[PDB]
Each structure stands twice: as C-alpha cells, then as structure tokens.
Design a protein around this nucleic acid. Sequence first.
DNA 1: GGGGTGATTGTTCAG
DNA 2: CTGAACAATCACCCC
Length: 93
Amino acid sequence: MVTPREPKKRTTRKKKDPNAPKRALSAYMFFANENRDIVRSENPDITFGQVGKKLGEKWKALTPEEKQPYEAKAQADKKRYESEKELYNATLA
DNA sequence: GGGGTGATTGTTCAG
DNA sequence: CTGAACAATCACCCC
C-alpha cells in the first residue's frame, strides 16, 4: 500500500527542477495512442466516458503480450527522456 | 540497506 | 484551459 489509490489533486502538476526532464510517457499513452483513434474509430458515437473507461478495461484485457508493442514502447520512451534527465543533472549540476 | 514520493504522460470530452 | 476517469511508471533521492 505504498501507493495510495485515493484522490490527491493530480493534473499537469506544476514545475519543480532546473531543467525538469519530466520522466517518460506510459504504456497507457502509447497504447492509448493506438486505441484513441482505433477505439473511437469504431465507436465515433461513444464519448470520452466510453472510449476512455473502455480503453483502460480493454487495455489490461488484451494481455502482457498485447502490450509488448506499447509497454515496450514505454521502456523506449523511458530512455527517450532518460536522455534529458542524464543531462538534467549533466547541465543543472 | 530499504523505502515511498512525487512527478509525469496522453486520450477523449466538455463549458 | 484544464481537469477528470483510465492506466502505468518508475526515476528520483534520501536517512
């Protein structure tokens, strides 16, 4: 329970850092990237309250393997920023 | 020697 | 604008 699942005002958090790399995207962004268009492309009638919520459920519904593309794309984006972070310190300090 | 924190990321949708 | 559900993350730094 190190990560409380209770609301704590979250959204485009403010700034905090000299260069502030800003970690990396998530397997949900890369996957949601493919879906967003797909999902909504198959349900242009359903709004965010359908495509979104249904996105998450179907997200984990696929399976780790199905995630390989994005999830792996997550480690890819993880390094992407990892560069701006290695410099974040190699420039800020 | 192990812990937990916060910060962030992107979509869609809307008044 | 921005947040809100939806989900993952996980790098960051410490005493």
